[PDB]
């Protein structure tokens, strides 16, 4: 019997830097509600325009000594618009926002496929999203880079130059968007040690 966490990250010695395991009841915005264990991410806002956009940081940021880190967050309902964005953002980046809209954070988001890097405009980065779809985010933290990753299958390089201690964040705008993250408790879809493996 192997402990999941650590089999993907040899190194990382939890007592110094604990590695995230689910999403914080604190370091969130507040039209974002938790449950199954802070696991699962419902959107609870107005969800009329971007002023109602509402992100959650997991509670811990990636250990620099995972080398590689990975999430996946499943899309359990679009709601009204699936307008949700996955990805990144450093300790105290507002959460009023879908991640990659402010500096210091990095998005995917679902409704038209862009990547959002630190506050620059989107660009055309990959797939739309939506209910029944898994997004993983990896991290590659020895060359600073983060690709994504949809139903098992790698995306391009969307972020170059990452900062580290970065934060597994998820944001969500409208109505009924609900989404899980699989923090590395559950097999992953996409195969994530093959990857691995080469760094």
């Given at each position: 019997?192997?402990?999941?966490?650590?089999?993907?990250?040899?190194?990382?010695?939890?007592?110094?830097?604990?590695?995230?395991?689910?999403?914080?009841?604190?370091?969130?915005?507040?039209?974002?509600?938790?449950?199954?264990?802070?696991?699962?991410?419902?959107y609870?806002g107005?969800g009329?325009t971007p002023?109602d956009a509402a992100?959650?940081?997991?509670?811990?940021?990636?250990?620099?000594?995972?080398?590689?880190?990975?999430?996946?967050?499943?899309?359990?309902?679009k709601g009204r618009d699936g307008y949700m964005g996955?990805?990144?953002?450093?300790?105290?980046?507002?959460?009023?926002?879908l991640?990659?809209?402010?500096?210091?954070?990095?998005?995917?988001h679902g409704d038209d496929?862009?990547?959002?890097?630190?506050?620059?405009?989107?660009?055309?980065?990959?797939?739309?999203?939506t209910?029944?779809?898994?997004?993983?985010?990896?991290?590659?933290?020895?060359?600073?880079?983060?690709?994504?990753?949809?139903?098992?299958?790698?995306?391009?390089?969307?972020?170059?130059?990452?900062?580290?201690?970065?934060?597994?964040?998820?944001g969500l705008q409208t109505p009924?968007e609900?989404?899980?993250?699989?923090?590395?408790?559950?097999?992953?879809?996409?195969?994530?040690?093959?990857?691995?493996?080469?760094?």
């Amino acid at each position: 019997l192997q402990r999941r966490l650590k089999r993907l990250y040899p190194a990382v010695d939890e007592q110094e830097t604990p590695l995230p395991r689910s999403w914080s009841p604190k370091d969130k915005f507040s039209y974002i509600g938790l449950s199954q264990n802070n696991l699962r991410v419902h959107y609870k806002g107005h969800g009329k325009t971007p002023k109602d956009a509402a992100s959650v940081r997991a509670t811990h940021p990636i250990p620099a000594a995972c080398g590689i880190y990975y999430f996946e967050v499943k899309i359990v309902s679009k709601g009204r618009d699936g307008y949700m964005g996955i990805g990144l953002s450093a300790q105290g980046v507002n959460m009023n926002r879908l991640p990659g809209w402010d500096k210091h954070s990095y998005g995917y988001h679902g409704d038209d496929g862009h990547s959002f890097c630190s506050s620059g405009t989107g660009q055309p980065y990959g797939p739309t999203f939506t209910t029944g779809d898994v997004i993983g985010c990896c991290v590659n933290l020895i060359n600073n880079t983060c690709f994504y990753t949809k139903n098992g299958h790698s995306l391009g390089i969307a972020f170059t130059d990452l900062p580290p201690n970065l934060y597994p964040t998820v944001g969500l705008q409208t109505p009924g968007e609900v989404v899980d993250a699989n923090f590395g408790q559950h097999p992953f879809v996409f195969d994530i040690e093959d990857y691995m493996r080469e760094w």
